[PDB]
Amino acid sequence: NNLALRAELLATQIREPLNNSIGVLQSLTSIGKSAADKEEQERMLRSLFSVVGGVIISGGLWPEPNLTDPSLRYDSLFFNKADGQVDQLSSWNNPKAGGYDRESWYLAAEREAEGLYFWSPVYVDPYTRVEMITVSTPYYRNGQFAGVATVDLSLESLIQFVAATAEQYNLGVNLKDAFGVEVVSHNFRTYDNALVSYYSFGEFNWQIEVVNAN
Ligand SMILES: [Cl-]
Asked: Which domain of life is it from (predicted)?
């Protein structure tokens, strides 16, 4: 057959939500690095999450906190794509609740070099309750680290996309993340010396194993 070719075609599709998330992150960092005030940034972030599609379901800006008046310490700008409307959530900003600067996806990007991207483990967002993977990156202002930008990928949407694509190409696929978690497993099994095509998106990035479907 043409297993290796179809496996590359599948990998190219699996790459789309990855590329898509990076692109949205770059828009977020543009907004964070800009001179826009907070109401203007909220406006642009709402518009951004209104226009993005695919598996992107939520995300936003996470300024370095000022740990005062309790309501002032945290001023995250976090947006969730619900009917089809976009909601801004304030849930991370009450100090009593712990704040956001100790979260894995914040810490991974904190004070890192602009232009580096970090992938969170799978988790259920404690406030939107959506199971997701998060890509994060730092943004800077005046040379000084200013905060973290995030984009959340819906796991459910990613699974449906990867599995539907594999099925169209008459493939089975297992996709694992940088923590070894099985993100998607669609019609994947090995017996009678079936060939497996392996493709790595990076040493600590996603991995796929691909078989022909019968
Ligand atoms: Cl699955």
From this structure: Bacteria
PDB resolution in Å: 1.8
Query: Cα of 185 to ligand 1 centre, how many Å?
Result: 4
CATH number, domain 13-154, options 3.30.450.20, 3.50.50.60, 3.30.70.100, 1.10.540.10:
3.30.450.20
**What are the residue boundaries of the structural domains of the chain, listed by start?**
13-154, 157-212
Centre of ligand 1 to C-alpha 159, Å, is 6
Ligand 1 midpoint to CA 168 (Å): 16
Using the mean position of ligand 1's atoms as its centre, give its distance from the Cα of residue 182 in Å: 7
The number of beta carbons lying within 10 Å of the beta carbon of residue 212 is: 17
Task: Please tell me the experimental approach by which this structure was elucidated.
Answer: X-ray
DSSP string, the chain: --HHHHHHHHHHHHHHHHHHHHHHHHHHHHHHHSS--HHHHHHHHHHHHHH--TTEEEEEEEEPP----GGGS---EEEEE----EEEE-GGG-GGGT-STTSHHHHHHTTPPTT--EEPPPEE-TTT--EEEEEEEEEEETTEEEEEEEEEEEHHHHHHHHHHHHHHTTEEEEEE-TTS-EEEEES----TT---EEEES-TTS-EEEEEE--
**Residue 111 CA, ligand 1 centroid: distance in Å:** 34
For ligand 1, the distance from its centroid to the CA atom of residue 158, given in whole angstroms, is: 9
